[PDB]
Amino acid sequence: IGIRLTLPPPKVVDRWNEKRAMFGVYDNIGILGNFEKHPKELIRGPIWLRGWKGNELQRCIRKRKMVGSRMFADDLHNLNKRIRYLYKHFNRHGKFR
Amino acid sequence: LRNRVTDRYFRIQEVLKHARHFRGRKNRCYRLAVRTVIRAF
């Protein structure tokens, strides 16, 4: 039987911590700030994913192009194989052709 | 396992309650119970 016999410890969420309270601030940096900055510049994350969106294959090509040279050998090999597989899947397989 | 069923017990019990009065493993084993319950209904 995969059900717990006690209630889980209750979840306390501070709805008014600094992160939640100041969420969304500067989203309109461009339209209210003479277009000196794009909102996309506020995005914090991987180099290859900053203010860009794409499917799994597109993301992998982008990663290889941008940070490929700095990658670990095993990680690079995996990315190469991933691209190779995704290529075959997206081009050669599916319902609609 | 980002999402997994936490309510499976109750899903099983919905079928099993109708199987209680059957004889044999039909009354308790879901795989067998479900088939007999569909027939019963």
Binding site: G2, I3, R4, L5, P8 | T6, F10
Partner: peptide, 26 residues
């Protein structure tokens, strides 16, 4: 251990009913 509250709560309620049925209060 599965994350969630609702299922555990429901099961507590079931066990409560079982306890009541097994040992009825005066």
């Amino acid at each position: 251990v599965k994350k969630g509250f609702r299922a555990a709560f429901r099961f507590q309620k079931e066990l409560e009913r079982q306890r009541l049925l097994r040992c009825p209060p005066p």
